[PDB]
Amino acid sequence: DEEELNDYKLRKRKTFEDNIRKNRTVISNWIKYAQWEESLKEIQRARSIYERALDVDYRNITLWLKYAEMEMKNRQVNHARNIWDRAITTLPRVNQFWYKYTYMEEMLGNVAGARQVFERWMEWQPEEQAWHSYINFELRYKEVDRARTIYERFVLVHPDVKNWIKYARFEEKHAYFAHARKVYERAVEFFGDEHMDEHLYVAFAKFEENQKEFERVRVIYKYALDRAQELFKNYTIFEKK
């Protein structure tokens, strides 16, 4: 039975090598060969197959994803960390590598120093979901001054009215009312000061109505004097209250 299994493995490897040699650029043959080698419990053989496939074409996302998933499905954690470090240093613009690296080093790794590794992604100015996930990760690690610096760099790097509203809500939920008032004042001074966005003023009026109704009425009057229908609705709400 061992000789028959060896002949079957030799025939399967010969057909896989012939399919590789017939069409080199077809990566599905590489993926099927690597998964068949991993299914027969040959980790270093599948690692050599994946390294050959990455030498053939390193720009494919799925080769890195499958080779890192094969490293993570076994106990080779440091091999997976090396694979993710190479995938980050070659292809920084693929956010899926960053997301799966952070889920590997946060759930399975459980290392806070990976957040410093995450700061490498903060060199690259990613999309806003990275900033939101880092805000929620710093909240899950119970840090609020670090998250204040994160949201300040988010406002400086990606300035938006929704971003300033999220900064105001995060400063209100972290029990820093003076910092929330200073952030609302800076957003009124900078974000849409002459553009007349009429949405950060509504959030400042809501924060003032949470704080003091006279300042909320003054903010509603200033928003009505600077200006739409939402400003008139906020002025009617301030006059009714």
């Binding site: 493995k9 090598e17 053989r45 390294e51 091999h79 960390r81 090396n82 470090d85 190479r86």
Partner: protein, 148 residues
């Protein structure tokens, strides 16, 4: 030149199998029939785009008008009104009369049986994949790892 209904069914099945532009492949099936005969029989009678309906008032008015304009040119007249030349000629005559795998696996099993019989009783410059890694590419090392 006769056409039985059996030959019409065989021709319909051959058109639905082999497409349109093959005709000699179709005429291989039909005994005592040519490819030109099969093409003419398809395009004259058995095509499903042939309007096998009755003539409307507009169709008859256009047929009488175009027969007045271009006399006895039915291959030109017929694609204008959408019918074929024979149907429109017959209808024009009628209107004037009215107006008047396993084998390789078995071979591999037989070769394995012969190999076990010879073992119970060169390499052709190849690469043996079961003996070692065929093209060993070591993974790149960095910042981690204590082996296993």
């Amino acid at each position: 030149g006769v056409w039985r209904n059996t030959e019409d069914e065989i021709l319909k099945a051959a058109v639905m199998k082999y497409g349109k532009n093959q005709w000699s492949r179709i005429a291989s099936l039909l005994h005592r029939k040519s490819a030109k005969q099969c093409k003419a029989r398809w395009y004259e009678w058995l095509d499903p785009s042939i309007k096998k309906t009755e003539w409307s008032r507009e169709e008859e008015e256009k047929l009488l008008h175009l027969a007045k304009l271009m006399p006895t040119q039915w291959r030109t007249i017929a694609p204008i009104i959408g019918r074929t030349a024979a149907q429109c000629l017959e209808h024009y005559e009628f209107l004037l009369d009215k107006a008047a795998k396993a084998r390789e696996k078995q071979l591999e099993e037989a070769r394995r049986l012969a190999a076990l019989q010879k073992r119970r009783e060169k390499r052709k410059r190849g690469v043996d994949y079961n003996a070692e890694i065929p093209f060993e590419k070591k993974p790149a090392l960095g910042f981690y790892d204590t082996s296993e």
